[PDB]
Design a protein around this ligand. Structure first.
Ligand code: HEM
Ligand code: HEM
Ligand code: KLA
Ligand code: KLA
Ligand code: KLA
Ligand code: H4B
Ligand code: CL
Ligand code: CL
Ligand code: CL
Ligand code: GD
Ligand code: ZN
Ligand code: ZN
Ligand code: ZN
Lengths: 402, 404
């Protein structure tokens, strides 16, 4: 009574036995599938803890031993005395890697074991927080040879407010409302841009203005910090055989670093745990630049390419989009900044799926997000059936602190 | 009532129709199985309950619920089943149920046309040679010398005891696939099995990679006999590219008429195991799926070689470039031959229009995001950023076991 899982390109079949351990409930019922939706005490804290502790001791091939019963005994003791408990550093590193490994919308998970974990649980203020973040950005960027990392700030605890990063990513471009009712810059960042303005930030008027950080220390208003310009590596976009493309003035940043997700580890919650990797070329080329509700350059490129934009049957959109993706890959390589194309990315995810079936008996995966947004069926994940479910440790969405 | 958002426009609706879904799918709160190709996995009291539901909405959709012939039609079905254990549909109900089953098909992107469907009633047929006639009429009326017209031919329903009408081919028009001396295929690998059956039931195999298969038609209880489609009834399109003159020399073609012939049509608790339907192609079905899938004709690297694309590295996006040109060639060829076809941008925008229509008429529309989104340029279409609810409504097309 585990689902059978077939790859239709190759004929392979597997059964997802891991989905039986799913430690939460999604939005789907037997009546109706909702897989496509973007947004799907002392005693329950104990069972999440116990399960996580059991997980940690399995991966160190020491389950059911002395140390295991001891650590299980310590935790309930501490939840009795304090209502919560503290992770050992090795548990935190393991918990943070498992969270990534468990993330169903991440096609990058072949890398989940190479994860640099920064322990900032001793963080005291918004100023210390900022220093940790610049240290993350510096390490992760590594002058173009990008490295995966995560910085863990102190956990939610009774008595104190949360540490929160208000920015959805550490590096984002401003989006300014215009006189045409429009947006100058990035329309997805209009709200945080208006929050930065009303917290003292003096805005620019360009299209690639890097936003300041809004950092919230517990029970403190958010404080504004400017990223030093030398810290944010950017890549100017040019096309290898379309020379007028460099005159569009387009840039993107090197480091994708998600900063508004909640990391959950054995019942403990970390509302601030930014993590960073490296880009897959379609996130920039296809989503960031071509989404109509983003930078929306697709017609401008196609017009410049002297394509026939009157009729859809000329496939001008598909043609413009492909060259924009080509320009992004060429540009990042010319600048020596790590980037993976959607063909290499999805081929390695398939290797991740086979590695995960042998170790855990399955792999949580959200097909609508794993398949790339152009050339879907040209990649090997298209023809692969996938099972989506929530394991813990996990990264979860959380409401905006404003 | 699930909230459903469109993330490119920001608009919000609620799907009230979903709650009126009955036959449960494969998902649970514990795990989503939306990506599976086969969800459902394949005392006449329950015939009456499906029959009365079907008659009720038949009478709702024409304002004539409460008083009138609506009362009287409910009694006739009652008596019909109490007498015979089954029942027969009025020709208007059969027409209505076929349009509903198309309208309810969650994977169909071309449902804006759901109201314009020619329904040939083939229920009074009792012969495989007769089936061949009906199929050949359908193909002629559907093809229409290239000006394609949606159509379905409804063969007799499954009756309790005694056999079943069935079409063994997956579609009415299929190319052969010939195994070799190394296990590779000449022609269409998707059809290596049914080609094997045609050979063992009589067919002399053919030349190469675009041989139209013979039909395999099964009258109830009798074995499937072969039938040979007359070549002038099978309109094909030789694929050329407008500016890549060598593309014609590749010798690729495709047929005009996509006609599915292995699905079961369910109306009012009745089942029609043979009910072949047809429409016209969306261009990516041919160029991207049939020609470019690795387990299909797999021509992608051949086209890239001739375009002198850097096949040494994936980062050149050579697969994306070749695929777009193959889709361009399909579109150009079909238009030159004046065979109805629709590109995936025109189709998905027609579907968004369908969704709004269906919002106002029924409070939503069942849609399968995985299949509605085209297989190239997905996020460039307006359906990509549209959240969608998948559920099962009746009437419906359903998968069924293969007759072997
Ligand atoms: C280093 C290479 C990485 C690559 C190539 C990568 C790629 C991606 C992509 C492409 C997506 C979805 C966006 C899309 O569909 O276009 C995604 C989602 C995600 N990734 Fe990865 N990622 C990487 C590193 C990481 C790391 C280091 C973590 C956590 C420690 C992580 C956690 C996540 C999460 C939680 C999501 C879902 C985000 C959401 O739902 O908003 N990823 N990743
Ligand atoms: C009129 C033009 C039509 C177009 C453009 C069209 C397009 C499509 C497409 C693109 C798919 C999914 C296959 C893919 O995306 O590669 C599909 C599936 C489907 N269509 Fe439509 N179709 C049309 C007519 C019809 C008609 C007339 C019927 C029935 C009366 C129908 C019933 C279905 C069904 C049942 C499926 C699901 C097939 C399956 O699950 O195997 N379609 N259609
Ligand atoms: C570490 C990392 C590396 C990488 N290379 N890529 C990513 C994913 C970035 C990404 C992609 C998306 F497609 C959408 C988002 C945010 C959308 C979600 C949806 C909810 F609204 C909250 N934020 C973020 C993360
Ligand atoms: C009338 C019509 C028009 C059109 N334009 N397109 C179609 C769909 C053709 C099609 C496309 C697919 F992508 C897959 C299938 C069959 C899939 C499942 C797998 C099972 F084996 C049985 N059917 C059929 C039908
Ligand atoms: C149906 C669907 C499928 C899919 N595969 N993908 C999407 C887009 C998901 C997405 C990606 C993003 F990158 C950003 C958003 C908007 C969410 C944030 C949260 C705040 F509200 C501001 N916008 C949504 C939608
Ligand atoms: C595994 C995956 O769900 C399956 O291959 C589906 C995905 N979406 C599809 N979409 C279309 N249009 N046609 C298909 O055959 C498929 N196959
Ligand atoms: Cl991004
Ligand atoms: Cl112009
Ligand atoms: Cl087909
Ligand atoms: Gd040039
Ligand atoms: Zn589901
Ligand atoms: Zn998008
Ligand atoms: Zn395919």
């Amino acid at each position: 009574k585990f689902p059978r899982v077939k790859n239709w390109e190759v004929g392979s079949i597997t059964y997802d036995t891991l989905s039986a351990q799913a430690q939460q409930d999604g939005p789907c019922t037997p009546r109706r599938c909702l897989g496509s939706l973007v947004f799907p005490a002392p005693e329950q804290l104990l069972s999440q803890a116990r399960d996580f502790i059991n997980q940690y001791y399995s991966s160190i091939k020491r389950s059911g031993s002395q140390a295991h019963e001891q650590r299980l005994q310590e935790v309930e003791a501490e939840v009795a005395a304090t209502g919560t408990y503290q992770l050992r550093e090795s548990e935190l590193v393991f918990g943070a890697k498992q969270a990534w490994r468990n993330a169903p919308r991440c096609v990058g998970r072949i890398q989940w074991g190479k994860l640099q974990v920064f322990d900032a649980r001793d963080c005291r203020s918004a100023q210390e927080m900022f220093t940790y973040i610049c240290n993350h950005i510096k390490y992760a960027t590594n002058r173009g040879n990008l490295r995966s990392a995560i910085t863990v700030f102190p956990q939610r605890c009774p008595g104190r407010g949360d540490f929160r990063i208000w920015n959805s990513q550490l590096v984002r471009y401003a989006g300014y409302r215009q006189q045409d009712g429009s947006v100058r810059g990035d329309p997805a960042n209009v709200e945080i841009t208006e929050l930065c303005i009303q917290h003292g930030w003096t805005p620019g008027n360009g299209r690639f203005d890097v936003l300041p950080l809004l950092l919230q220390a517990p029970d403190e208003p958010p404080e504004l910090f400017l990223l030093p310009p030398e810290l944010v590596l950017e890549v100017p976009l040019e096309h290898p055989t379309l020379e007028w493309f460099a005159a569009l003035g387009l840039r993107w940043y090197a480091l994708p670093a998600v900063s508004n997700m909640l990391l959950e580890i054995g019942g403990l919650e970390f509302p601030a745990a930014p993590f960073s990797g490296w880009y897959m070329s379609t996130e920039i080329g296809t989503r960031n630049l071509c989404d109509p509700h983003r930078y929306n350059i697709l017609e401008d490129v196609a017009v410049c390419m002297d394509l026939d934009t009157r009729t859809t049957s000329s496939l001008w959109k598909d043609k413009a989009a492909v060259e924009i993706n080509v320009a992004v890959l060429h540009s990042y390589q010319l600048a020596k900044v790590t980037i993976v194309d959607h063909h290499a990315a999805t081929a390695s995810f398939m290797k991740h799926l086979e590695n995960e079936q042998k170790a855990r008996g399955g792999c949580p995966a959200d097909w609508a997000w794993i398949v790339p947004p152009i050339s879907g069926s040209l990649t090997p994940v298209f023809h692969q059936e996938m099972v989506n479910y929530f394991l813990s440790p996990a990264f979860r969405y959380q409401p905006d602190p404003w």
